[PDB]
Design a protein around this ligand. Structure first.
Ligand code: CA
Lengths: 34, 49, 34, 49, 49, 35
């Protein structure tokens, strides 16, 4: 049978997670300036 | 920039970080649904035969 | 075999996710009032 | 009405959004657990049979 | 502490909550991939045989 | 002879991390109460 392949969606989630982490990094950097 | 302005922007970045998490969960639903559908459409028929 | 059916929980996740989206909407509009 | 009270309410709303995400992640665990159980209790025996 | 310092600590705590959610999602990905790989390497070849 | 799938370790970690997230929100809300 053809294998299940959800790599497209998993790779998308990994990409959105990296974005989420960058925003939190930016938030904390601003808080550090206070 | 003031302490109040800094706090307002901090919370704005945090909300964007949550918005990305929300997107992620949306796609996690899609991935799991795809596994469900693959099991139902490709595996169960095969196993029934 | 009986088919696997997790559509209820997945649509429930979709519901809780829209609630989360509205909470961010409110939060963002209060910050604008600053 | 004060800037400090506005920031307070904004953070309170962000927290609620995060709580909703927490609930959604809890249900994702159940959904994935259900797939595991289905594979183990239905598909695996069927193939071993 | 001041109101400003309190809002600041409130927002670090919230960011740490988002980070824990980020970690939890990362592991959701791992769990779903494990399911996909199990289907493709254990179930599918079995049915093929 | 097919080993059952077992992702219980990762699922239990996701659960613990979810509980850790709830704790951080608890603390945030508590600080906000003290304002
Ligand atoms: Ca409040």
């Amino acid at each position: 049978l053809d294998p299940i392949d959800i790599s497209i969606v998993l790779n998308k989630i990994k990409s959105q997670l990296e974005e989420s982490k960058e925003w939190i990094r930016r938030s904390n950097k601003i808080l550090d300036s206070i | 920039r003031s302490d109040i302005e800094k706090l307002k922007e901090a919370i704005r970045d945090t909300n964007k970080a949550v918005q990305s998490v929300q997107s992620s969960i949306g796609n996690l639903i899609v991935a799991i649904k795809s596994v469900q559908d693959y099991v139902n459409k490709e595996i169960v028929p095969s196993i029934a035969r």
